[PDB]
Amino acid sequence: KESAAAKFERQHMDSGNSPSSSSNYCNLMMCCRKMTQGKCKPVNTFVHESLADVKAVCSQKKVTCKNGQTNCYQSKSTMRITDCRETGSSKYPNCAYKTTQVEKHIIVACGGKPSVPVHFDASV
């Protein structure tokens, strides 16, 4: 069981950061969304457009998937996204990310019926 001391540190300590930062977004979000367990997911993109807009990409332009599958689609317009890229100094379990605010077209793999995004392939 997690020690009471460790629980206090988890719930109540943030010595190394503050709210006023913008650069800590990826560190917190990758943690929040469970992509830092077992290993640090090296690269991950968050999209800030509506879910409806992102879902709509599956009905937009067919493009090549980076993995050679044929289920990828590119957004008709640029989208507000944040790229989270693991830094050189990052070392599990202390997963460190550079937060980059970007506006680019996204490419998603789609699957299911209705076809919805299942994989974030790239931004272009």
In the annotated binding site, the residues are: 7, 10, 41-45, 66, 85
Residue 111's binding partner among ligand U2P, a second copy, none (Cβ under 5 to 8 angstroms by kind) is: a second copy
The tokens for 3 are 């020690």
Q: How many residues does the chain have?
A: 124
Per rule CB under 8 A, is residue 89 in the interface with a second copy? no
- Residue 46's nearest CA partner among 35, 60, 38 is 35
Least gap, CB of 46 to ligand U2P (angstroms): 8
Give the integer Cα–Cα distance in Å for 17 and 6.
18
Residue 122's binding partner among a second copy, ligand U2P, none (Cβ under 5 to 8 angstroms by kind) is: ligand U2P
Per rule CB under 6 A, is residue 75 in the interface with ligand U2P? no
Find residue 46's DSSP bridge partners: 82
> Which residue type is seen at 33?
R
Active site residues: 12, 119
